[PDB]
């Protein structure tokens, strides 16, 4: 008789797992400067 | 009459893909406060 | 004669590799504005 057929193909492989997480965004720029303090007090009253 | 010999394995199966890519990361945190601002102006002399 | 049997079937596909890892993220917003700064120093006397 004949050689017989060759068997069926292979069953696929599986997709790989997913990646990791991409790193975290850094943190963002600070703020502006605060604006300036009050004007001090006027000093005390001086002979003429 | 005889029987043929048996059939050759079959090819192999397809490869698995590449997994998915992981999610890009997060927004990062706000940055924090501006720095303080500067401290005023000298009080004025006192008067007379 | 008969024909010989399928053969069996093939091997299994390799599995995929994992997938790429994230871009990291976006940048942080601008944090706010800075604090007010201190008060002035008092001025000096009348007639400095």
Same mark, same amino acid.
């Given at each position: 008789?004949?050689?017989?057929?060759?068997?069926?193909?292979?069953?696929?492989?599986?997709?790989?797992?997913?990646?990791?997480?991409?790193?975290?965004?850094?943190?963002?720029?600070?703020?502006?400067?605060?604006?300036?303090?009050?004007?001090?007090?006027?000093?005390?009253?001086?002979?003429? | 009459?005889?029987? *043929?010999?048996? !059939?050759?394995? @079959? +090819? &192999? #199966?397809?490869? $698995?893909?590449? =997994?998915?890519? /992981?999610? %890009? *990361?997060?927004? !990062?945190?706000? @940055? +924090? &406060? #501006?720095?303080? $601002?500067?401290? =005023?102006?000298? /009080?004025? %002399? *006192?008067?007379?």
């Amino acid at each position: 008789g004949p050689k017989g057929d060759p068997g069926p193909k292979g069953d696929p492989g599986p997709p790989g797992p997913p990646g990791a997480r991409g790193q975290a965004g850094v943190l963002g720029f600070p703020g502006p400067p605060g604006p300036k303090g009050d004007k001090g007090d006027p000093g005390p009253p001086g002979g003429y | 009459g005889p029987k *043929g010999p048996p !059939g050759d394995k @079959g +090819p &192999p #199966g397809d490869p $698995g893909p590449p =997994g998915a890519r /992981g999610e %890009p *990361g997060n927004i !990062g945190f706000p @940055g +924090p &406060p #501006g720095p303080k $601002g500067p401290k =005023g102006d000298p /009080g004025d %002399p *006192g008067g007379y």
